[PDB]
PDB file of C-alpha atoms and ligand atoms in Angstrom:
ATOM      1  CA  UNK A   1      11.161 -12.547 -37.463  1.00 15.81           C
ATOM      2  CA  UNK A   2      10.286 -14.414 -34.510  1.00 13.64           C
ATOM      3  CA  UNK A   3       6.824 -13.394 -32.763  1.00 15.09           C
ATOM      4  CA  UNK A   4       6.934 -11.929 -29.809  1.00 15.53           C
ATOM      5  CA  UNK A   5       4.241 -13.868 -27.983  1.00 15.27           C
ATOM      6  CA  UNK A   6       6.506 -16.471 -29.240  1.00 14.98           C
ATOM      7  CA  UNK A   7      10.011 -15.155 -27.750  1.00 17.84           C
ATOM      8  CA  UNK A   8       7.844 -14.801 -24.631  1.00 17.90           C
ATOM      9  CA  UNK A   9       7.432 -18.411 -24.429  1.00 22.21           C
ATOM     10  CA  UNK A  10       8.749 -19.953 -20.439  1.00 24.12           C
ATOM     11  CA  UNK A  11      10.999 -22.999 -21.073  1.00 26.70           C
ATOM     12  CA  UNK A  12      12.953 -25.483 -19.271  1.00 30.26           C
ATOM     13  CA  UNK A  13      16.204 -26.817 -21.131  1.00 28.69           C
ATOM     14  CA  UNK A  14      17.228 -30.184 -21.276  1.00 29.49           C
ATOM     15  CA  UNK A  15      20.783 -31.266 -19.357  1.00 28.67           C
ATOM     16  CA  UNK A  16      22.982 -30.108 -22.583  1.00 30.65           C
ATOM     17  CA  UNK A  17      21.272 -27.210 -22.910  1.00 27.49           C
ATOM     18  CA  UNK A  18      21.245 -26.112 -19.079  1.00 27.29           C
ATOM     19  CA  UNK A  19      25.078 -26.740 -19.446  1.00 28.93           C
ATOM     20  CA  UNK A  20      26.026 -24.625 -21.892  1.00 29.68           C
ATOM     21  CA  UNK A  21      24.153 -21.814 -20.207  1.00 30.32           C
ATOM     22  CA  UNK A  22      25.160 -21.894 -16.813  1.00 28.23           C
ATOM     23  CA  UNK A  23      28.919 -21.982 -18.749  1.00 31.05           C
ATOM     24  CA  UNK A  24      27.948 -18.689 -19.493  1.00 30.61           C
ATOM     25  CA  UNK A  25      26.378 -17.480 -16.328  1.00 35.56           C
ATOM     26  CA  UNK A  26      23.061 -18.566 -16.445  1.00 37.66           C
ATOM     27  CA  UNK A  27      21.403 -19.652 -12.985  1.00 37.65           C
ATOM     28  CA  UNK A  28      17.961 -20.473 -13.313  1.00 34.93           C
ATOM     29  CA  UNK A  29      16.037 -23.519 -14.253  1.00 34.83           C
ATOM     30  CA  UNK A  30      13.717 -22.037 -16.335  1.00 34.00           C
ATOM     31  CA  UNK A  31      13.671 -19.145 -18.498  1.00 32.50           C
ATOM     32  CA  UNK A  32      11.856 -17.156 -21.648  1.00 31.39           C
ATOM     33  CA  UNK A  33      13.145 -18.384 -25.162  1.00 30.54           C
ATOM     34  CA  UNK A  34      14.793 -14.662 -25.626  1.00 29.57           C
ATOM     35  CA  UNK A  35      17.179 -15.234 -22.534  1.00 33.89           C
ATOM     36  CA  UNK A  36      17.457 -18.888 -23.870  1.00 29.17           C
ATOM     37  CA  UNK A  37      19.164 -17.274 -27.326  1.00 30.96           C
ATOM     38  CA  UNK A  38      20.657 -14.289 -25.429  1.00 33.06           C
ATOM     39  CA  UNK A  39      22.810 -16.814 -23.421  1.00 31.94           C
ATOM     40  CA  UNK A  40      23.242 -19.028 -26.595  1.00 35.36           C
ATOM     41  CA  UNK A  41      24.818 -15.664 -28.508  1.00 36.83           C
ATOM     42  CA  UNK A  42      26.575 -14.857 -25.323  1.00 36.78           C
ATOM     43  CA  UNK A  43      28.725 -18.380 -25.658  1.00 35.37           C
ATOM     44  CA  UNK A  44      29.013 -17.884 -29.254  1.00 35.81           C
ATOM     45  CA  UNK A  45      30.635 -14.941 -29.061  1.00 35.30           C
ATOM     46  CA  UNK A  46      32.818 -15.351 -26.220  1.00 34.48           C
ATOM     47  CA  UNK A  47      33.933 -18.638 -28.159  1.00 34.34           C
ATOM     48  CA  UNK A  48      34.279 -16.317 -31.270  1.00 35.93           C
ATOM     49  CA  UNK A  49      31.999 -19.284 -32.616  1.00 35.22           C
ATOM     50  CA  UNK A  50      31.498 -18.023 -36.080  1.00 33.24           C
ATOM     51  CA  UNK A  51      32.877 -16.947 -39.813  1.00 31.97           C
ATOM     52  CA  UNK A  52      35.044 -14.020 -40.129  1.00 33.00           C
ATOM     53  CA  UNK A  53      32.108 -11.469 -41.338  1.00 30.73           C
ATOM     54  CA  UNK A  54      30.125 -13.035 -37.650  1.00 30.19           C
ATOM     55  CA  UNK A  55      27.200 -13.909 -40.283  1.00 31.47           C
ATOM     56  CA  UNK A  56      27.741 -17.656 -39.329  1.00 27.56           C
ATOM     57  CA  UNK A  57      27.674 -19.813 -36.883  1.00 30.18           C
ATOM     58  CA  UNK A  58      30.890 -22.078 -36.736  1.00 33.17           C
ATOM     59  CA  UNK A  59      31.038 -24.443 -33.817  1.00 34.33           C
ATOM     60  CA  UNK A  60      33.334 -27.708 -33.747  1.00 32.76           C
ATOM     61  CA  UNK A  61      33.052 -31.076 -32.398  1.00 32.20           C
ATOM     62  CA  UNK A  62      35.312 -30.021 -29.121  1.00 30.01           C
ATOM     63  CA  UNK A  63      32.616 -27.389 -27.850  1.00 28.64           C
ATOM     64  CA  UNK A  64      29.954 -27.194 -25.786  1.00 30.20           C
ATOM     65  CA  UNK A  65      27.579 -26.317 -28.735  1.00 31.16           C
ATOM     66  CA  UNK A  66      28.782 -29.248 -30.414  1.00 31.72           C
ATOM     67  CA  UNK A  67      27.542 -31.564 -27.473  1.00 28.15           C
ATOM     68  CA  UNK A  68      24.267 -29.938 -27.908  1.00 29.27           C
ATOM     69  CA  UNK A  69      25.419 -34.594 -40.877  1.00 31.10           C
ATOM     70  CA  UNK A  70      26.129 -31.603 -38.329  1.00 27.27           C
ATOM     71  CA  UNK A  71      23.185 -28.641 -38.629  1.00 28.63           C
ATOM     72  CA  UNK A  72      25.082 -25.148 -40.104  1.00 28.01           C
ATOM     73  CA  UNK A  73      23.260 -21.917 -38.458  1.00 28.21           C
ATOM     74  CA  UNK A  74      23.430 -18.617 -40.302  1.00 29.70           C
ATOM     75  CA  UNK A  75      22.398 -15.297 -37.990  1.00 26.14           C
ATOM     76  CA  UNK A  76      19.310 -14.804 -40.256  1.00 26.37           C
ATOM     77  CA  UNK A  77      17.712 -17.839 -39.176  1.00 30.18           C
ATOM     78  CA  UNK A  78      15.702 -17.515 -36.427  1.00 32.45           C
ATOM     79  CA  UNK A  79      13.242 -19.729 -37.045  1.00 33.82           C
ATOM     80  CA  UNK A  80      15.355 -23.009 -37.982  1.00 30.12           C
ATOM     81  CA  UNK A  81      17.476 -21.487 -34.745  1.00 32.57           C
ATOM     82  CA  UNK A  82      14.278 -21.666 -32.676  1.00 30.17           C
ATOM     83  CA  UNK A  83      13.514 -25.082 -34.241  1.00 30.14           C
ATOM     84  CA  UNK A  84      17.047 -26.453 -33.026  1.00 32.51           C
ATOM     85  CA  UNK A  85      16.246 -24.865 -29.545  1.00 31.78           C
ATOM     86  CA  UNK A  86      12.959 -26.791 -29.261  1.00 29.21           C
ATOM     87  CA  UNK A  87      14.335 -29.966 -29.015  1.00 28.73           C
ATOM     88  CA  UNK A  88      16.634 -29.091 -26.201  1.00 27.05           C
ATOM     89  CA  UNK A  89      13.872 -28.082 -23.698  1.00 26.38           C
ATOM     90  CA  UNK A  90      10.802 -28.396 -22.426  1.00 25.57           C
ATOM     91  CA  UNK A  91       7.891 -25.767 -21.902  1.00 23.90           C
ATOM     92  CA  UNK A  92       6.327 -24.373 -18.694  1.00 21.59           C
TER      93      UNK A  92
HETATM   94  C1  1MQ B   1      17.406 -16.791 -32.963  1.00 21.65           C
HETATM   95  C2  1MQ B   1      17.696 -15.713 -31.887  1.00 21.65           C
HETATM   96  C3  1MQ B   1      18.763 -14.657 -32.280  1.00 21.65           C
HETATM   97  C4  1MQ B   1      19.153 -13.537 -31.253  1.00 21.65           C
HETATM   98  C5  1MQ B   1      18.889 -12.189 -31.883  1.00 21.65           C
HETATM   99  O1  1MQ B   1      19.453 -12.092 -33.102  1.00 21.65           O
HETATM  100  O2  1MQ B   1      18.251 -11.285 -31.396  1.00 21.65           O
HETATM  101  N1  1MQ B   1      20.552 -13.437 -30.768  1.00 21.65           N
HETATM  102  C6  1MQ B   1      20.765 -13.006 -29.478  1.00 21.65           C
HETATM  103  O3  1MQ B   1      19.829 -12.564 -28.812  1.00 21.65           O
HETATM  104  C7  1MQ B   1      22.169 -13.056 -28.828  1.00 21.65           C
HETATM  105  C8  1MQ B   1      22.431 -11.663 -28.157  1.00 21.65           C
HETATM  106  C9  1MQ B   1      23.876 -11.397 -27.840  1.00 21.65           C
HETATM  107  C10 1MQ B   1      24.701 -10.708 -28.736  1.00 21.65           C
HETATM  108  C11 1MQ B   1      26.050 -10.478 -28.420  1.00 21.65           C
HETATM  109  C12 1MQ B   1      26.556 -10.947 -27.193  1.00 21.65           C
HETATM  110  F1  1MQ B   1      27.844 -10.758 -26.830  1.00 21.65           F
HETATM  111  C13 1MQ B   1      25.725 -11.637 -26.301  1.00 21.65           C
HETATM  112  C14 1MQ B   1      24.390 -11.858 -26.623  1.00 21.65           C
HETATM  113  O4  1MQ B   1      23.177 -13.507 -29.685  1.00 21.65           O
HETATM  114  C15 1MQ B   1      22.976 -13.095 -31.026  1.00 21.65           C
HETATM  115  C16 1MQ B   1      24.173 -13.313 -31.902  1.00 21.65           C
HETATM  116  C17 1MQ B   1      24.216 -12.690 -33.159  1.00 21.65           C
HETATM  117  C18 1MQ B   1      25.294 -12.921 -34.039  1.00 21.65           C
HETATM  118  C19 1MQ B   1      26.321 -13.797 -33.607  1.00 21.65           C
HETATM  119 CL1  1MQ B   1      27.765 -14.222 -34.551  1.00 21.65          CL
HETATM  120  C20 1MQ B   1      26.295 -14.419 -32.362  1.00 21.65           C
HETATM  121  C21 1MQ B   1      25.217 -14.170 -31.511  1.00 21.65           C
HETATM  122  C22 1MQ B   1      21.690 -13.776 -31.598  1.00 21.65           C
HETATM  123  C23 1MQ B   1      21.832 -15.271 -31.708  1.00 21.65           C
HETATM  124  C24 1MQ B   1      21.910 -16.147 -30.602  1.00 21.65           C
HETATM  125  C25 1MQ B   1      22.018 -17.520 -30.777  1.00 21.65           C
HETATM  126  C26 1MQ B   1      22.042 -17.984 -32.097  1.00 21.65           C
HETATM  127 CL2  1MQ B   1      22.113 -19.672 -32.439  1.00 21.65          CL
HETATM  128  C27 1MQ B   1      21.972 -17.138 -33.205  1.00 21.65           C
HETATM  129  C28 1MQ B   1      21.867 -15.778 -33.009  1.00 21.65           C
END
């Protein structure tokens, strides 16, 4: 649901960010909003960060997402996931 002019989009994250991904393998400084998410999902899953059915996001105050009134993600939402993501970086 996300254009893909839009998912296109170079960015530069913020020092949380940056973290989180590089946790995961990331090594650039700057990247497209789809790798952005792609490495995002990639932590998410390796920290089984999520509800049993994996249609939630479920992080806790101990992980790296945490770091990043606590915002609940559902898989659907790309937009309000985007949104989140915005904050945490800067464009190119
Ligand atoms: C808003 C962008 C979303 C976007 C996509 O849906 O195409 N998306 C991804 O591209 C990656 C891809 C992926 C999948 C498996 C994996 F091992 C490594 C990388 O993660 C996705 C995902 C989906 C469900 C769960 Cl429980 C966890 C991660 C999913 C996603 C990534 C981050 C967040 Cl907050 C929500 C959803």
């Amino acid at each position: 649901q996300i254009p893909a002019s839009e998912q296109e989009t170079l960015v530069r994250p913020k020092p949380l960010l940056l973290k989180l991904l590089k946790s995961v393998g990331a090594q650039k400084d700057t990247y497209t909003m789809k790798e952005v998410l792609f490495y995002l999902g990639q932590y998410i899953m390796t920290k089984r960060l999520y509800d049993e059915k994996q249609q939630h996001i479920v992080y806790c105050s101990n992980d790296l997402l945490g770091d990043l009134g606590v915002p609940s993600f559902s898989v659907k939402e790309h937009r309000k996931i985007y949104t989140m993501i915005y904050r945490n970086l800067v464009v190119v």
